[PDB]
Every structure is written in structure tokens, then in C-alpha cells.
Amino acid sequence: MSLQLLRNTRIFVSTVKTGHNKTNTQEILVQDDISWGQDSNSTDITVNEAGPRPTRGSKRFNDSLNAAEWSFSTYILPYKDKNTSKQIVPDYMLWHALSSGRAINLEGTTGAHNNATNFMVNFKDNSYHELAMLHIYILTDKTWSYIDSCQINQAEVNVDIEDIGRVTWSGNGNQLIPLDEQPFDPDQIGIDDETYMTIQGSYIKNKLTILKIKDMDTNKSYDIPITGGTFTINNNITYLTPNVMSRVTIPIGSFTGAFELTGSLTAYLNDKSLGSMELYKDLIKTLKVVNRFEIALVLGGEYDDERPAA
Amino acid sequence: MSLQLLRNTRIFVSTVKTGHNKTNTQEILVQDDISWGQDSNSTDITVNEAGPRPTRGSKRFNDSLNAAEWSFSTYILPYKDKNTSKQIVPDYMLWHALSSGRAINLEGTTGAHNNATNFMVNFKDNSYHELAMLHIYILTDKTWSYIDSCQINQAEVNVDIEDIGRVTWSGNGNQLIPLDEQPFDPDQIGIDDETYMTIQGSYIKNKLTILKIKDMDTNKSYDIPITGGTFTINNNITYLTPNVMSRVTIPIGSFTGAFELTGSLTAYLNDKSLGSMELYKDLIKTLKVVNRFEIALVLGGEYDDERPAAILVAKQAHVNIPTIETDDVLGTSVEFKAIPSDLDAGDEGYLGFSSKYTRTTINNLIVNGDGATDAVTAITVKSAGNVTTLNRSATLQMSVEVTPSSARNKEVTWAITAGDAATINATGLLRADASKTGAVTVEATAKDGSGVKGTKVITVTAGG
Amino acid sequence: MSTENRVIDLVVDENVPYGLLMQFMDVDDSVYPSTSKPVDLTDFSLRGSIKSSLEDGAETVASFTTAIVDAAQGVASISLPVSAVTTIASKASKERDRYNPRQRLAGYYDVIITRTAVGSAASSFRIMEGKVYISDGVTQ
Amino acid sequence: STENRVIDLVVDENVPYGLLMQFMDVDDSVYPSTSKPVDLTDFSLRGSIKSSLEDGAETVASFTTAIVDAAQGVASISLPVSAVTTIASKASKERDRYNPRQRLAGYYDVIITRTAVGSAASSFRIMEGKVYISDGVTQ
Amino acid sequence: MFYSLMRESKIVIEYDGRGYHFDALSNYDASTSFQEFKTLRRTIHNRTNYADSIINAQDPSSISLAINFSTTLIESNFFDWMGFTREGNSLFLPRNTPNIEPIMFNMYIINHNNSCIYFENCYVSTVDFSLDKSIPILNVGIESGKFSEVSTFRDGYTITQGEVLPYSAPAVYTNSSPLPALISASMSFQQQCSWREDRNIFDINKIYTNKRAYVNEMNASATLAFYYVKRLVGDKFLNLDPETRTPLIIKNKYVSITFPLARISKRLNFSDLYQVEYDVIPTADSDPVEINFFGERK
Amino acid sequence: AFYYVKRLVGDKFLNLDPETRTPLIIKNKYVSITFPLARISKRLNFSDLYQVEYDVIPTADSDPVEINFFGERK
Amino acid sequence: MFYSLMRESKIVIEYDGRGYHFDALSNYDASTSFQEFKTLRRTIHNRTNYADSIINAQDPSSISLAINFSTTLIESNFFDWMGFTREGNSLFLPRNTPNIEPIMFNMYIINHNNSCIYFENCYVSTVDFSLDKSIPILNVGIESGKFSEVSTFRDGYTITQGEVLPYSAPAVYTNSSPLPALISASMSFQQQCSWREDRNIFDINKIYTNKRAYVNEMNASATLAFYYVKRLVGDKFLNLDPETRTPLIIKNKYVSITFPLARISKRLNFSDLYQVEYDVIPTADSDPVEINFFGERK
User: Fold this and answer.
1) Shortest alpha-carbon distance between residue A234 and chain E (Å)
2) Backbone phi and psi for residue G69, each to the nearest 5 degrees, phi listed first
3) How far apart are CA C2 and CA C9, in angstroms?
4) Which residues of C are less than 8 Å from D121 in CB distance?
5) Where are the alpha helices (DSSP H) in chain A?
6) Rounded Cα distance, A306 and G209, in Å
7) Is the minimum CB–CB distance between E152 and chain F shorter than 8 Å?
8) How far apart (Å, rounded) are the C-alpha atoms in residues E117 and A254?
9) Phi, psi angles (nearest 5°) of residue F57
10) Helix, strand, coil shares of chain G as percentages rounded to 5?
11) What is the dihedral sign for C-alpha E93, E96, E99, E102?
12) DSSP G223
């Protein structure tokens, strides 16, 4: 006899369905916009006669279940952990499952791997039909539940100045399963106060955003003060569900699509040398089918003293 | 020389274009959102050349008129009239034209028919290509007009808590015709102050909304406090218009589509026994292609003292797999559809309106189909001569006592459930044999579908 | 290898006696073509009953009268008198069906042929099954 | 083929009604079907017109059976103009969809019968359907 | 009355006196019809307008089923009934057709209220499935001789298809060298039988139904679609030249069709991204074509 | 074109057997095409809802096919 | 590895030892294939299932190019190669076909990383363009005999198509009287050659490629679409009667196809707005059909 509030939700990301420890599961600090669920398909069979006294009756059949949808937003919060003394982001397994389809290995050189200097994510090893497989665990107040065999579909990052650096995750799962018993003690696995202090020491502010753009065909670096932007890491993952007429079906497997890394950057027109106006005029004067630009969007700004940045 | 305001509109519903009296026409109390009209189709013929000095000119032709659209909202206002002393809703002919395609007969048993206890609407006789035919009469200030040969397309009912019980009507007509002369005196046909007082005495508040849902495959009643919902009665009526190139055309006849009785019910997740969480978990754990649920949405609440209420009953309903609606307080949506037992059987559901519903009245409406027909509430089975046991090779013709004493269906069936030491017939003459040394049971259930249980544990022994 | 058709639905006519006769024929497929000889119905009796429902405790609407017409030709007739037809008509469901208001569902019926004798094995056999319908009449 | 017992009768107002049934026995064993007529011996036909099929329905009228030319199988069913008037009196005021002159008057069925031709009462229904009154103008 | 919904149906195949209820059925299509002899005898005496039509035969039915792969591998019986020899869970394409006539079986299409349609003298004439980026499904095609309406039937309570197999990406190999840039591997197997119409003058005034048939040929075929990819300039492994004999295998986690020696023909399309298309058939002296059915864990 | 509907198990009136001669009429409120004797061939399609399709032609010795044209009130 | 994108390609036609790189190419389509001889030797001894297929010939390729008009008028060489005689910038349709065999040329389809497909023994078999309210474009159709994969190639650095010509509305005249209400003027020119297959017993165990061909006929045709317009009652100029001989010209700002004498057949369609359709072919004794190519300023 209790009502469940969204504010008491806690999200854990796992790679295993049993033997949950601190290296397989960590809490993900989510925000208000968290959402999850699973929709179902149906069908109505109606008789369409033409004579007088026609039959007017319908009938519904449950035929299939759609892939589970989940989404949440998290702050980009790089920091160094005391155990390994290597810079790591708390939602690092999300980055790994986004980046590569191999087992997580922070000591390696592909996907999500860290260092004594910075945490790095490269997409050099994402040629897989099924990327690294996660299991989102949802804890609302007292009741437990989880989504089985999730995959990171995309990660939206919105460069919204006068706001904090944030990333929005989206994905799909085979099936949302409600759990009656506690899988693991959330008190132990959840982040403690010490690492919370360490994290809140480091925040990324979207206002202090410098951009470095260079035309590789002409060797021309431009000075473009940004007004607002966004970039996405998209996998275009589609979940396959079998069609059975006698029984309802849930998705069985998936297949990654085309990996897209796009972006959009808004800025004011500047008449100064190597400004926005010069870039716009050069781009509309060349009229080339292909361009070779080097773009380095630096969230959090660049400084001589140590500062957080993405 | 005058401007016409929407606030002075008055709507009358008629089944006849002449001889208007109080049994063929009544005023329908409409609200601000009333709307009506008729749109027209056209076409542009343009020459599309390619050479220099091309012809750039168009031409328009009126080709057809669309079916007239009308809609308005009314309050569900059950009451009893002084003339007949039978509970009736003021917009009863709208309910009839929605329910059945026969001539209106409140004394009957199909479509919109009333009683000394409640007003009832069932869809057991809607197998018609052209339902009961109405004529909406519109009176704005001084000028008259009406829509010819209307049909009730649907009736939207929105369960919006902290608001009054209301129903929204929609439909189509062949043609909207403006009338210069008064068809009938609106002063006489319009509702007078006495019936207005009687009506305003009875209002249905959507807040006091209890819902009764039961899984017929498992016999599990759930306690779901609603947050907001809606149910629709839809006919999918399509109006046919002829295509003539030389003259504009208006629709000539129609044809009813597939009768749909769907719904959607939102509620918060409850961890208590037989709550929303249990229903959601059961529905997502079974994963069945078909569901058999009994849904009885009771607008206005149930009480021991007399209260107004509007009740929708779906005997064999189909419930979609629920989803969790993540809000500040977690919730869910229970979208259902009332399907019939057989396609050409009708009986997808029915409705009962009255200003006097005691809990027993709505209970026997749900389980018997009529608020006046009483239904059995409890049973204790009785043996032949107050006998408590039985011995080997002995008969026991057991009887039954039922409550209330005025239930229409006083009969029961007979069955053996626990143990194998006796057999029972249709009449109830229990029979045993030798080598019966175990405790056997006997059960009885009524034939009206009430859900009443009659049990007794007879201690059959091997004898002396 | 083919299928049987044990499920047969009967339609009776109100106010008219109903007569159905069954012929049992021995069959075989061999080098010579299909040889059929009538089954000799000696000590063969029939018995059929009608109830308004399949579920246990169903009210017995009526019962069929059984007779054997010709043992040598293997013909047995299963029928009911006109009074039984009226009895079943009274107990039928009142729910009519459009496009033919005559027919109403009366219940379910079964027929068992049995051979009971001291030397004969206690063997029964449900030859048929199905539902019984009634064609309501106005005359009489 | 199959069964075609259901045929609806349209009787005329103010006019006596008479139907002529040529009983026949067609057999399709030979490709030109045999035209052998049944021989009308020990045969009697009975038919009543009763509004609705429910029990206790009032008898609107009763057919008058005529057996003529037994050798060639033909027979006649009829009823006097007074019977026609009695039928038209009790007919419903609602008119048929396809013809705005017909009104449903009731149901009917005629039953052939053999009375101890072989010590058997082999009576079975011949035909059935609905009786429709067609409103006249002459009277 | 009782309407008949496709979703509320059950298809049971009757073979050897046992009912093979084929659940996990995505969709099936069937039709029944009759053959007529309609002639118009217009003469100089009477230029008539009314034809002389008599129904004398039942047109053979063409039933197509789409069946999902299942863990109990009942669907391999379609290869078994179509003529393939069995060893364990692998089906061989025999060098020669075993018998003149195909393997005949009956099929039921059950529905509610004891309604049924009884197809008799059926044989499996086509089986093809596409290994692609969607869930694999094999469309079988059977032809019937006689259709009928029956009251009681055969219902496969026990013999049924299990859970559908999870998706697994296809991969085609040459020996053990993978072939890069696969798009869609489609396999096709056929038993191109032919009805032997024996309608004679003893069937006049009667409805004739086809009963016997003979196998014209059996075959195994596959069409492979790739992207035109080259790793070297003047490459020898990947090119457009035909390959008279080369060992090929279209492998999955649950099925593997093996061509011990294959005849490959290539076809290049200059589309948005260049695509090459193979046409794989077994050679003259190739060993029997393998079709393995792995339920779980190979 | 009909929907495959059966009222009884092993029904005789509604089935798939051909009908050599049967009186048929396709009636409306304003037109009625009459076949005094018709040759009907049936065809069943196992679609979403089973549909049977007739093929009605007049027989060899059938009486002339009627086509009535009723303007109003028959 | 290296994928092959259509957008990243370059089509160079090799004629007379010079490379004609045809830029301003909107879209091209091509395919390559082989011919097989597949027989199944089913015998009473062994009713086999494995066919005897050998690849022995290359199926001729059908390459279609869609080329925009250009200011340097390289595209008129397609008329030049297809058989038209040249005087200045105007192409004549000769009264008689000049030679038995067409003008043969090779074609390359270049791509990145030294990848190429080499079509040989090609000839231009069809050229048609529609003068309409959209930008004109001529779809050429060439047929190849032999296709091959080569490492180095011919790339037309200098000979290339210039800028596309700006759109200009078409207009059709009779002498100098304009024809009103034009919709779409479509012109068609063909060189209906035929391959002479000379596959003989000396080519057994070898792949055969077509090499020689002969011209069955050349022709010039045009289909004109108008709106049915009449200026007078019983008009003589504009009607539906056929015209045995009438001088016609389908003129543009950059091209003008001239029929010195034309045979016009008319066809009326009772559509939303009545449309008449012409069928213009040159007469028997008509002078050669003109095709002028004006780059700029006529």
C-alpha cells in the first residue's frame, strides 16, 4: 500500500544478470526527464458487409510487443578515482557500449579506455552487429525492475550556453521485466559521499565553449565564437521481432545500423579576420562536393590552470 | 437588421419533419462548444504549357457538397419524469439513434428503453445499415435552420475528474437547410422550469468514480482508483455522395461501419493487494493474445443512499498490455475494448442511467443487466432434514436457501469439488457407495452469473 | 488414413416426427476392389440423449427412441416421436437468428451403439455426436 | 438444388388467392432428368397462417387444401376472399423495403401427410416462409 | 453465425498417422476452386446465348506457409518430406531422385466450431528462406489434389514448434576464408513435381480430383548478394570471373547450407554502391548438398 | 463475394459444392437482376476473414435473365 | 577495404585514341553478366539432380547514360558516333546508312584506387531527349560486347563537358508559324544494330565475347504533345486530319531539330483538358533531318 514517485528513482547499469559487484554495476545519476517503458501492438478484425442488417462487430488480438524504450539525461562529470588514480567518467560503461562491441577493458586502446591524464572514447572498434550489451536496472522507491539486454542507441549532447554540460542517452531493450526481489544492495553499489564530493568538484559549463575549426584543404584556422550547438553519436540500431499469429512475441536480437557522428553549430557573423563571415563566404564561393575540415569542439574551455573539459 | 450570438442557440432533436409534438421533439441542453456547418468541394483546371508566351489562367468548378458536420456537448442528467414515473435522460432519442436502428420504443427491451428504476441503453439491435434517423433543429436567436436526416456517428464521454459528467455527440447529415418560418413553437417544446429543477437536482460528478475490473480467466477483482479516462461509442458512419460532372451533388444515403466500444483508463501504481501494480504485472507476465475482462465503469460513485450515476458495463472486454506513464507520480494506462461473444451477436456492452442507485441496484444491473431485476447475493446450502453427515450407500438430496427472497433467478447448479466419495445429479440427489471413507464436499452456484458461493463440508464416514 | 465425421448436427422440424436411419457396412481395401457387406446387427442396441449443455449437471431435454430395422441389411433407425419434438421445442433457446428466424439451438446429443451379452465384452462406442437444432413451425 | 422450402407468398388485398402446385419428382441419375410426377394418393395438406413463431401465437388464418388431378401430381392451396380480408386486417403497418405495397402478415407452412398408406403417418413439411399482404386500390 | 478468422486457426499436417501441428506460423495463404467445361453451342438454327457449363474437376490448390525457425526443428520435416535423405540433424540432397512419386501427406486447416478444410494428396514443392538482416523465415509451398470440408479432424497437441530461434547474423565462407561485405543470402530448394491428369470417360458426370504425381527434378540453389569490394589492384580472390568448382558454405548460428563444390556466376550492378550478385548451384560431380539444423549450442 | 459463413456443422445450404441449377436474384430497392436458373461455382480465399466468391451464369435451358428498373416506389 | 561508390566515378569514352571524359553526367546505369549452358542429364539409369552448367559466353552489356547539355557540345559526338554526317555544328541524318557495321569505341568507368571496368566494342544504339518545362537531358544507350577489369586506364583530363546550358522554353514551328499550346516535345534517334553471334566449335572450353555487328536501320522520330486548341469553327490549320508532308522544326535557344518534310499523325485524348499528340517522322523523299547544336549566342 504505497504510491511511487519519480524523484526516488535510481538507475544502475550492468553487464551481468548475476554476480553484481562494483566493477559490473554502477549507479547513473539521472535527472527529471528520465523515462522508460514498453508498448504493445494489436489489431482489430472487423467484418465489412454491404447488405441490409449487416454484422457490426469487431475483435481485438494482441500480436506483438515492441522493443522497450528508455532515456535519461546525465551530467558530463569527469574525475579521478582514488582506487586506480585514472581519470574516469561515472557513466563509463555507457560510453563503452556506445563506442565498441567488445568486452570492456580500460587498459586497452579502443572504445572507452582511461589514463592517468584523461578518459578517452574512440570508435575504432565498433564494427559489430551487436555492441556491448548492458542491463539497465531501475529502482523506484521500493519495487525493482530492469530492462533485459539493452543497447545504447544514441547519445545526444546539446551545447546550450548558460547551462551545464549534459548528455542524453537513448536506447532499446528486449523486454522490461519487473523484479520482486532485490538484485543487489543499492546502498553499497550506489555512489558514496566521498566520490560525490569529488564529482561535484568538477562540472562542465557549456558557456565556456571554444571551437577549433580548420580547413585541411587550405590550412585556414577560423575564430568562431559559438552561440549554441549540438552533436550526436547515433547507431541507428533496429530491433527485430518475430511474427507469430498464435502467440505474442518480444524482440529477439538486434542489428546496428550506420554509425553517424553529426553536429550543428550556430554562431554570429563576424567581419573580423578569419571570422564567421570569412568561413561562410569561402564555403559558398568554393562550392565543393566534398570538404575536409578539422573540428575540435571543446566544452568547458581551455585554460593554463587545470579545468574540467569534454 | 440584427446580429446573431451563439449563446442564444437552442437545439431540438426530431424524428419527423412535420407534426412536431412533445414525443417526437425535445430540446437538447447544449454548451459553448456547439458547432455545425457544411463544407463544399471544388477544383481548379489549369493549363500547363511549356513554350514561350504560355497561357497562365485557371478556372474553378463547384463539384460536390460534403456531408454536414455537427457536434455539441451535453451533461448526463438522469431523472424521473412526472408523466410516466420512469427514469429517463433528456437526450434519450440521441441514445436511441446511437444504440439501435428501429423505431423508438421505451417499453421494449432493445436500444434505449427505460424503467421505474433506471434508464438503460443496450446495443443488441444495431445490425442495420441505417440507424434511427434524426433531424437536428437549430434555433439561433430568431432565424431557424435544421440538418436533414442526421445520424449519430459517435458519443464521446470523457472521465475528467474534478469536473461534471458530460457526453459529447458527433454526427453527419445529408444537408443543412435554413428555414425561414418557425417549424414549431420552441416555448412549448422546450423544457419548462419544473423539469429544469428536477434535472438540476441530479448531477453526475466525475470525481466520485469507482471502477470494477475482474479477470474472467482467473476470478481476480482489482481495486484501481482512477486518475482520468474516457470511453467512446463509435459507429464509423460514412456518407456517400454521387459524382456528377454537370451539377453539384449532396450526399444521398449512408452506411454504418464497425461498431466500436473502446476506452482508456489512467491510474497510479499501487503496491497494495489487488492494486494497479498487480494488474500490470499479471498482464505483462501472461502475455496472452486474447483477454476476458469484466469492466464496469461507474460514474458518480456507489452509495447506500440514493445517488445519481451513469454506468458502462463491458461483460467480455479486451484489455491491452498496460504501459507505465512516468510522471511526478508513477502511473499506468488501461486501454480496453468491449468485444462481443460472437460478431453478429451485438451485446458488446450496455449502459444504465438513473438518479436513484443504491449499491444493490448497480450490482444487479451489472450481474443481471437490469437495475430492477434483483440478483442473488449469498447462499448457504441446506441438506435434507438438517443432516450433518452421511454413511456408505446413503442418499442426500440437498436443497438451497438464497438471499434476497425476490431474486429473479433462484436456481443453482450442482458440483463436487474436493474429494471423491459421492456423485450428484442435476436435481441435487447426492449418491455414494461403499469404500468411501474420506471427506467430500458439495458446491452450488447460481445461473445468473452473480458469483455467489454455496459450500458445505459433509463428513462422510465408513458407517457404524 | 482419411478422416471420420463423427460430429453431425441434426435439424428437426417442429410438430413433425423426426426419423434418421443409419446403415453400418463392413469395408476393406485389398487386391480385389472394395468389398462391402452389411454388418449384422444382432445384440446391437442404441441409446441417445439430449442435454442443453455439455457441462456436467445439464438438464436432459429429451431422449431418442432406438430401433433396428433390418439386421441382414445392417440398417438401424434412430428417431423421436412428435411429442418429443414438441418437448425439445419447448426447452430450446429463445434466441433467434436473423436471415432465418426458424432455427433455434436445442442442445447436444450423443449416440452409443453397444453389444451386451454374457459372452460379449462390455464394449460401448460413441458412433456420433453434435448439436440438435429446431425448425420452428406454425401449423399445429 | 439442396433445399428451397423457403418461399414467400404475396397475397392481394380484396382479391381471392389460389396457388397451383405441380408436384414433381426429378431424378438426375440420367442426364436428361426424369420428369416423373408423384402420384397423389392418401395425401392431405394442412397449412395455417400464424403471426410470429412464438408459442401461443394467434391463428391469423388457415389454408384450404384442394387435391385435384392426383394422377399427374398437381394440387391446389387456396383461401377465400374473406380469409384474405381477415389476414389484411391483422397485418403490420410497416411496409416492405423492396415493395412499398407489401406488409408482413405472418408466417406459414404446409405439411404433406400419408395417412396409413402403409400403416405410417409419414407427414413432413413441404414449404415455408412469410405471407405478405399487397394493399389494393380497387376497393 | 460463425465467421472464420485467419488469426483464429490451426494448421496440422497429417503424415504417417501423426499430426504435425506447425505453430510459429507467421502467415499462410490458400485457395480452392473448381474446373469447368463451358462451351457455347451457337448454331445456324439457334444462335443461342446460354452456355453449356458443367463442373467436372477440382483445380489443384496451391497452399503457401511462412514458418519461423523453432528450437524443436519440426520444420526440417519439410525437407524430409520433400525428398532429402536424413542423417542425424543434417539433410542431404541425394545424387538421384529416390522415387518417381513424391511423398504424399494430408493437411488440415482447423478453425473454431468444428470447422475445417481438408487438403489431401499434398506434396512439398518449394522451400526457400533468405538469410538476411531480418529474422529468417522459410516459405514452403505445397500443392494439393483434393480439398474437402470435414467435421472432425486431427489436432497436433504434442508435436508442435517450440520457441522461435533468436536472430543471428549470416556469414558465407569459402573453406574457412570469410567472404566480405555480405548483404542478403537467399537459399532455394525445390521438388518440381507435375500432376498426371488421368481424367477419362469413366469420370463423366463426376468431379475429378488429381491423385498421382511424378518428380521432374530436385535441385538446391542459392543467390548471394555482396558489395563489390576489392582489396588489391588486379585481385585474384575477388573478381568477376566465373568459378567452375569452389567449396562454399552459407553459415549461421543455427543453420548451415553446404555446397561441397559450387558453380558460381557473378553479376555486377553499378548502383549507388556497387553490388555483385552470385548464382550458386552445385556442380555435376559435387557431393550431396548439406543442410544442418542446430537447435541450440550447435 | 461473400464471407465464408456456416451455421451448422456439415451444413448443406452453405458449402463449397457447385450448384448446377438454383434460382438466384441480386435485388436492390431500384434494380433486380434475376437468374431463373443459375450455375454457381464457389471459390474460397483464406484471407484475414475467410471469403467465398461465386461465379453466377445462367444455365443452358434457363428462362431469360431479368433486369428490372424501378424508378421510385418500385 | 575499398568500396565503389557511383558518385565517386568518372566515365571516359575512348575513341580514335583520345579520351572523351563525359562530365555533367546526371546518372548512369550498367550491368555485367555471363551466359551459361545448363542441362540436366536425367536418365533411366540415374535420375540425377545435379546439372551440367558451363560458362561459355559474356552476355552483352547495356549501358545507359544521362548527360546534361554543355557549352562545349561534346555530347554531339554521340550523334557523330551513331552515324550522322557532320557539317559545322549541325548533324544530318543520311539518306542511306553509310556502313554495314556501326562505329565501335571503348568505354571506361573509372573509380578510386586504380579500379576500373572496361567495356569494349561499344556502339551508340539510342539517343532521346525531351524538350519540356524541365531541364533537357539526353539519355544515350550503348551496348557492349566485352567487359573487363583493368588496372590502368584512359582519363580525359582535357576533353570534358563544360557548364550546363541554361534552360530555355521549347517551341515548335511550321515554316515560321508557331504551333500553339505545346506541352512536351520528345525527340528520339536510334541506330538499331544487331549482334552477329559467331560462336563456333573452335570456342569450346572458352569464354566468347561478341565482336561484330551490323546496322539494321537508322531513324529519327519525335512525339509532340499539345492541347487541343481550335481558333475557328471548322478550322483548316488545326484539326485531326493527317498531314502527308509538312515542314516542321522543334526549336530551342540551343538546339533545333528540323524535319524538311514530315508525316504527322494525330491522336486526341479526352482527358481533363483535351490533348492532341503528334507522331512526326520524316517522309520518304524528305531531305536529311537536321540537328543543330548552338553553344551560346546561336
Assistant:
1) 19
2) -65, 145
3) 20
4) 17
5) 92-99, 186-189, 193-200, 276-286
6) 72
7) no
8) 38
9) -130, 150
10) 5, 55, 40
11) positive
12) E
Picking from F8, F10, F11, the nearest residue to C5 by CB comes out as: F10
Task: Quickly count: other Cβ atoms within 10 Å of residue E17's Cβ.
Answer: 7
Task: Write the residue in G169, G272, G273 that is nearest to B51 by C-beta.
Answer: G169
Contact A91, A171 (CB under 8 A): no
Query: Rounded to a whole number, what is the distance in Å from the CA of E71 to chain C's nearest CA?
Result: 30
Cis bond upstream, residue B404 (ω within 30): yes
What is the C-alpha end-to-end distance of chain G, expressed in Å? 50
Helix (H, G, I), strand (E, B) or coil at B344: helix
How many pairs of residues across B and C have Cβ atoms under 8 Å apart?
12
Residue G127 CA to residue G77 CA, distance in Å, equals 11
Instruction: Name the nearest CA neighbour of G181 among G168, G170, G166, G197.
Output: G170
Q: How far apart are CA E256 and CA E241, in angstroms?
A: 26
Sign of CA dihedral B405, B409, B413, B418: negative
The cell for B70 is 455537427
Cβ atoms within 10 Å of G206's Cβ, excluding its own: 10
Nearest chain B alpha carbon to C53: B426
Q: Chain A window 16-55: which residues touch F at a Cβ cutoff of 8 Å?
A: 45, 47, 49
- Find where cell 448446377 sits: F20
d(CA C2, CA B451): 45
Q: C: neighbours with 3+ CB pairs under 8 Å? A: B, D, E, F
Instruction: Give backbone dihedrals phi and psi of G36, rounded to 5 degrees, phi first.
Output: -120, 160
Grid coordinates 524482440 are at which residue?
A: A251
Q: Which of E229, E244, E282 sits opposite G50 (nearest CB)?
A: E282
- The upper half-sphere exposure of residue A7, i.e. CA atoms within 13 Å in the direction of its Cβ, equals 2
Q: Write down how long chain F is.
A: 74
- What are residue D2's DSSP bridge partners? none
Q: What would the DSSP string read from start to end of E17-49? A: TEEEE--SEEEEE-EEEEEEEEE----SS----
Q: Are A209 and A37 in contact (CB under 8 A)?
A: no
C-alpha cell at B239: 456518407
Chain E residues 176-195 within an 8 A CB cutoff of chain G = 180-181
Distances (CA, A) of B75 to B156, B157, B158, B205, D86: 12, 10, 11, 10, 50
Round to whole Å and give the CA distance between B299 and B165: 7
Locus of grid cell 412464438? D54
The reply to whether residue F8 touches residue C5, judged by beta carbons under 8 angstroms, is no
b/e for A138-164, b at 16 or more Cβ within 10 A?
bbbbebbbbbebbbbbbbbbbbeeeee
- Largest distance between two CA atoms of chain C: 56
- Is the Cβ of G169 closer than 8 Å to some Cβ of chain B? yes
Give whole-number Cα distances, F60 to A110, A133, E40, E113, G64, in Å: 84, 74, 9, 39, 58
Q: CA angle G27-G31-G32, nearest 5°?
A: 150
**A-chain residues near F48 (CB < 8 A):** 45
Size of chain C in residues: 140
Question: Is the minimum CB–CB distance between C4 and chain E shorter than 8 Å?
Answer: yes
Chain D residue closest in CA terms to C16 = D124
Resolution (A): 3.9
- Name the nearest CA neighbour of G277 among G265, G295, G285, G290: G265
The number of helix segments (H) and strand segments (E) in chain F equals 0, 6
How were these coordinates obtained? cryo-EM
Q: Which residue of B has its CA nearest to E4?
A: B343
> What H or E segment, with its residue span, contains residue C85?
helix C82-90
- Do residues A226 and A265 make contact, with C-beta atoms less than 8 angstroms apart? yes
CB contact under 8 A, F7 and E1: yes
Task: List phi, psi (to 5°) of A239.
Answer: -100, 130
Q: Please, are residues G248 and G287 in contact by the beta-carbon 8 Å criterion? A: no
Cβ contact E230–G114 (<8 Å): no
**Strands G105-111 vs G137-143: parallel, antiparallel or unpaired:** unpaired
